[PDB]
Amino acid sequence: GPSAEEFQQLRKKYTDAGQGHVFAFVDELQTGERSQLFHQLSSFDPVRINELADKALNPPKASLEPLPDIATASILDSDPKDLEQWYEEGLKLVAGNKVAVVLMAGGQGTRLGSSAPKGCFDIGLPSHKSLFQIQAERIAKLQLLAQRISGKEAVIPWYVMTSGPTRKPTEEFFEQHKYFGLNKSDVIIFEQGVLPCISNEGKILMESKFKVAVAPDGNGGIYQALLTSGVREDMRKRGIEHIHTYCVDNCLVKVADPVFIGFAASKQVDIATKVVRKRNATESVGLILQKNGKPDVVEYSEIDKETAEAKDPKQPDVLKFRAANIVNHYYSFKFFESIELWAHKLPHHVARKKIPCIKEGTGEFFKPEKPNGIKLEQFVFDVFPMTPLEKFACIEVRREDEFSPLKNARGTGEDDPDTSKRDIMSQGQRWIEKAGGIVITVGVEVSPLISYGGEGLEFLKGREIKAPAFIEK
Numbered sequence: 017g018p019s020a021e022e023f024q025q026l027r028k029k030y031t032d033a034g035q036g037h038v039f040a041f042v043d044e045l046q047t048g049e050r051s052q053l054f055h056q057l058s059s060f061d062p063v064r065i066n067e068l069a070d071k072a073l074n075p076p077k078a079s080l081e082p083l084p085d086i087a088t089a090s091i092l093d094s095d096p097k098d099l100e101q102w103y104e105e106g107l108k109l110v111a112g113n114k115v116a117v118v119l120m121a122g123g124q125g126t127r128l129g130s131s132a133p134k135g136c137f138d139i140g141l142p143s144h145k146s147l148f149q150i151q152a153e154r155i156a157k158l159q160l161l162a163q164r165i166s167g168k169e170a171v172i173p174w175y176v177m178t179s180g181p182t183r184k185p186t187e188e189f190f191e192q193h194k195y196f197g198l199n200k201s202d203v204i205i206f207e208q209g210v211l212p213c214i215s216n217e218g219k220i221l222m223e224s225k226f227k228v229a230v231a232p233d234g235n236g237g238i239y240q241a242l243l244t245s246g247v248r249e250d251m252r253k254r255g256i257e258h259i260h261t262y263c264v265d266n267c268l269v270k271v272a273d274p275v276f277i278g279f280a281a282s283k284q285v286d287i288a289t290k291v292v293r294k295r296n297a298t299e300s301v302g303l304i305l306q307k308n309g310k311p312d313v314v315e316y317s318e319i320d321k322e323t324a325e326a327k328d329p330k331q332p333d334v335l336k337f338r339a340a341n342i343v344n345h346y347y348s349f350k351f352f353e354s355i356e357l358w359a360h361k362l363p364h365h366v367a368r369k370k371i372p373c374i375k376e377g378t379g380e381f382f383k384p385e386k387p388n389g390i391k392l393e394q395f396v397f398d399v400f401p402m403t404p405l406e407k408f409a410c411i412e413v414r415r416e417d418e419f420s421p422l423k424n425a426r427g428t429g430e431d432d433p434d435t436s437k438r439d440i441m442s443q444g445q446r447w448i449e450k451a452g453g454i455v456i457t458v459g460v461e462v463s464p465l466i467s468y469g470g471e472g473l474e475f476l477k478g479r480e481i482k483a484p485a486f487i488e489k
């Protein structure tokens with residue numbers, strides 16, 4: 017294990033930093049436990065922890081308008097000829113092996129109450145497919161469509177960001193499913209980083225006598241993680257130029273959506289993002305807007321209930337701020353090549369939490385009654401203000417085709433397994449109907465390997481399908 021000299025130098029650092037309590041139980045640790053504590057403490061800089069705690073617990077003490085029209089767009093307002101062109105252009109970029117996907121799948125799904133990673137969840141479709149599998153098959157299908165135009169292999173590498181709680185069960189799940197028919201060599205599971213949890217008094221919390229309480233560093237942890245994992249280097253080696261980044265929990269996510277990629281690429285933006293119309297004042301969504309001349313987002317946990325209810329001057333029964341973030345982002349690869357210059361600039365969001373820890377005295381593991389500390393998180397959209405308005409685009413899409421998050425346990429009424437299932441099977445039915453199918457009957461599941469977004473269903477014209485149904489290969 018670590019030498020006595022190594023250990024004393026670490027202890028000095030932490031003690032000088034006012035964090036020497038992390039060594040309170042060293043004298044009763046086994047060799048292994050002492051080794052773990054040494055290595056874990058060595059991974060943090062206690063002076064930086066003090067910097068973070070200070071900014072969080074003693075923060076320094078609203079030019080806030082809707083995004084201007086130059087930076088916004090809407091599928092509803094689009095010329096269908098342009099939609100067709102951007103689709104074709106996106107598919108051509110996929111065919112050129114220029115498109116990558118980053119999946120943010122490090123969330124714990126604590127509102128959901130599942131023991132498995134959220135992506136593994138079965139929302140009760142006829143197929144019993146997981147969110148992960150549905151997403152993988154969307155990638156597979158787009159590759160197939162792209163190969164029809166190129167006559168060459170089309171690959172969309174899938175970079176799956178997990179946390180400590182999610183990584184091993186995620187990798188096992190992918191292996192057990194043989195990567196859902198994608199090539200293992202083009203799917204990379206990597207981990208985001210963590211930050212120490214900090215007490216209300218600014219002290220590192222000890223989960224045990226030999227372990228610091230940590231949490232994942234928020235989805236804004238993506239950027240630093242792309243470097244350390246080797247993912248950015250892999251994207252460079254493959255000639256990636258366009259990246260779609262999204263959240264695992266959206267059962268309708270149009271993975272590597274070619275219209276979105278084609279549109280972004282055509283406008284030559286650094287960053288593009290999708291929104292839907294906020295469904296009410298209390299919806300738990302970030303709001304995309306202009307702050308101090310800059311594109312920005314106000315998260316639902318940080319907005320004041322006055323700006324959430326701010327009504328349109330012209331239309332007093334409609335909300336001023338209603339561009340709901342659906343966690344569907346486009347980046348240029350050039351944007352990723354500059355991460356090192358601004359990753360440190362991202363703010364740390366503060367959440368007060370009940371962090372299980374050791375009774376600072378006994379050493380007994382105790383679940384606190386009231387919030388005893390804070391967790392720090394970076395948010396993926398806090399890059400938006402680094403980007404000029406002219407290199408940013410915010411597009412409205414249709415909720416019922418694009419956004420159906422799995423947030424809550426079954427039996428909630430909203431953003432749960434039942435709404436997810438309903439939205440998927442309603443989507444399938446609408447596509448079949450538009451293609452001339454007659455659905456008797458609620459809804460029909462259409463496999464992504466049959467249809468990515470409504471195409472390829474001509475074979476169903478005139479046919480009668482008894483709902484509920486599952487259309488597959």
Ligand SMILES: CC(=O)N[C@H]1[C@@H](OP(=O)(O)O)O[C@H](CO)[C@@H](O)[C@@H]1O
Pocket residue numbers: 235263300301302303315316340341342343395396397421423
């Ligand atoms: C940091 C981040 O990405 N937050 C997102 C994300 O919130 P969650 O706290 O992860 O549920 O998903 C929302 C959509 O479901 C979106 O509106 C919000 O801004």
Ligand SMILES: OCCc1ccc(O)cc1
Pocket residue numbers: 051052053055056059
């Ligand atoms: O990079 C994470 C640091 C770390 C090292 C060893 C541990 O046992 C725990 C955490």
Ligand SMILES: OCCc1ccc(O)cc1
Pocket residue numbers: 089090091094099273275276279290411412413
């Ligand atoms: O003008 C809006 C075109 C557009 C439509 C849908 C997308 O997903 C992206 C861009």
Ligand SMILES: [Mg+2]
Pocket residue numbers: 200201202203204205
């Ligand atoms: Mg792999």
